[PDB]
C-alpha cells in the first residue's frame, strides 16, 4: 500500500494533562526557591529601607511585637482557664443545632469565632473612655476630669505599661488611674479598655483555640483581627469591638472612615490587606514606594519561615497567592 503516508486517527492531540501535571511540579521548585537563603543582596535593601523610611521601621517594629507573641502555651492555657468554656461551647453547640450548613465542613470553627465575639462583648470585656471613680460608685465616669498622663508606678510597671492616664473625681477628690497595659494576661484581670487592648486580648483569645489568627493595623488608628475560615477557605475579618464577623466594609463605608494603609501581622507572615478594607474614601498612600512595601512584607514573611519545611513553605505560599488574587480582584473565590 504505502508509501502513501498513514494518517493515524487524529493529529498532534496536544497533551495538556501532561503539560499541566508537569508545571505544577516546576512551580513548586520556583516557590521553594523563592522562600530560601536571604542572599545578602536584598539584605541591604532591607537593612537600608528601614532607614530611608519610617513607615518601614514601623512595620518592622510591629512585626516583631505582633507575629510571634500570641503563640504562647503558658498564656493560651491561662486564657482557657479564665474563659467560661462551658458557656461558650454550649452556645456554639446550640447554634450548630439550628442546622450548621448542609456541609458542616469546618463550619463549627466559624460558629465558635462568632460566639467568642459575643461572649467577649456582651459578657467578658468592657469599654472604657474615662474610667469609673474608684471610690464613688460604678456608673460614674462623666464627673472625672483628666490631669494627663504619666509613667507607671512600681506595680503596674510589671504589666508592660507605658502610660497611665490619671483622672480626678470632682465629686470626691480621689484620683482613679487607668494604666494602659500591653500584657494581655493582665487584661484578663482588668477586663476593660479601648480598640487597643480589646484587640490585644481578642487576638490572644482567638489564638488560644488554636485558630489561625492575625492582627490587622490601620494607620488611621484602629486595630482588628483576621481569622482563617477553613470553611470559607479564605481570611475572615473579625472586629471584637464591633462584635463583627465578616464585614470588612464596616470601616470604609458604614463608618465612612477615610483610610490609607492596612497591614496584617501573624506567625506565618505580614501582608498588605488594604485592598480588603479601603474600598472608598481612599486616602493618598504617600508613605512608602509601593514597590518597597511589597518587598518589605515579602522579606519579613520569608524571614518568618526559615525553620519551616518544604511542605509547609509551599502550602503557605499558595494560601498567600490565593489571597493576592482575592485582593487584586474584587471578590472571594
Amino acid at each position: 500500500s504505502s508509501g502513501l503516508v498513514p494518517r493515524g486517527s487524529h493529529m498532534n492531540n496536544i497533551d495538556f494533562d501532561s503539560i499541566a501535571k508537569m508545571l505544577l511540579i516546576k512551580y513548586k521548585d520556583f516557590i521553594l526557591s523563592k522562600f530560601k537563603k536571604a542572599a545578602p543582596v536584598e539584605n541591604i535593601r532591607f537593612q537600608n529601607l528601614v532607614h530611608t523610611n519610617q513607615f518601614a521601621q514601623g512595620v518592622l517594629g510591629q512585626s516583631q511585637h505582633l507575629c510571634t507573641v500570641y503563640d504562647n502555651p503558658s498564656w493560651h492555657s491561662i486564657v482557657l482557664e479564665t474563659l467560661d468554656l462551658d458557656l461558650i461551647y454550649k452556645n456554639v453547640d446550640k447554634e450548630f443545632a439550628k442546622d450548621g450548613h448542609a456541609e458542616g465542613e469546618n463550619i463549627y470553627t466559624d460558629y465558635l469565632v462568632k460566639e467568642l465575639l459575643r461572649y467577649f462583648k456582651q459578657d467578658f470585656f468592657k469599654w472604657c473612655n474615662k474610667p469609673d471613680c474608684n471610690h464613688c460608685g460604678q456608673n460614674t465616669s462623666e464627673n472625672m476630669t483628666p490631669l494627663g498622663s504619666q509613667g507607671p508606678n512600681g506595680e503596674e510597671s510589671k504589666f508592660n505599661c507605658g502610660t497611665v492616664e490619671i483622672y480626678k473625681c470632682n465629686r470626691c477628690g480621689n484620683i482613679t488611674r487607668f494604666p494602659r497595659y500591653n500584657d494581655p494576661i493582665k487584661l484578663l484581670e482588668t477586663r476593660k479598655g479601648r480598640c487597643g487592648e480589646w484587640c490585644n486580648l481578642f487576638t490572644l483569645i482567638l489564638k488560644s483555640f488554636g485558630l489561625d489568627v492575625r492582627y490587622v493595623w490601620n494607620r488611621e488608628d484602629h486595630v482588628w483581627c483576621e481569622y482563617f475560615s477553613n470553611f470559607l477557605n479564605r481570611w475572615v475579618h473579625v472586629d471584637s469591638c464591633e462584635q463583627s464577623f465578616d464585614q470588612p466594609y464596616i470601616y470604609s463605608i458604614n463608618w465612612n472612615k477615610k483610610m490609607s494603609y492596612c497591614i496584617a501581622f501573624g506567625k506565618d507572615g505580614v501582608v498588605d490587606v488594604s485592598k480588603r478594607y479601603i474600598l472608598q474614601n481612599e486616602l493618598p498612600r504617600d508613605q512608602i514606594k509601593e514597590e518597597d512595601l511589597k518587598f518589605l512584607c515579602q522579606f519579613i514573611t520569608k524571614r518568618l519561615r526559615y525553620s519551616l519545611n518544604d511542605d509547609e513553605i509551599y502550602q503557605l505560599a499558595c494560601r498567600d497567592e490565593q489571597e493576592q488574587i482575592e485582593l487584586i480582584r474584587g471578590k472571594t473565590q
Binding site: 496536544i14 499541566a20 505544577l24 488574587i325
Partner: protein, 55 residues
C-alpha cells in the same frame, strides 16, 4: 515573547496554586484564545512552561 493578558496571568496564578485540577482545561482555553502560544506549546512545551513561570 511571552504576553498574555493580566486577567489571564491572574486566573493562571489562581489555579496553579488553588485549584490545580483545573490547570489542564485552562491551558486548553489559552491556546484556544492565543494562536502563537498554541505554537510554542507544541514546538516545545518545556520552554513554554518556564516562560510561563514568569508571572
Amino acid at each position: 515573547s511571552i504576553g498574555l493578558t493580566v486577567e489571564d496571568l491572574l486566573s493562571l496564578r489562581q489555579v496553579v496554586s488553588g485549584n490545580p485540577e483545573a490547570l489542564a482545561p485552562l491551558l486548553e482555553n489559552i491556546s484556544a484564545r492565543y494562536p502563537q502560544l498554541r505554537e510554542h506549546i507544541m514546538a516545545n512545551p518545556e520552554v513554554f512552561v518556564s516562560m510561563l513561570l514568569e508571572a
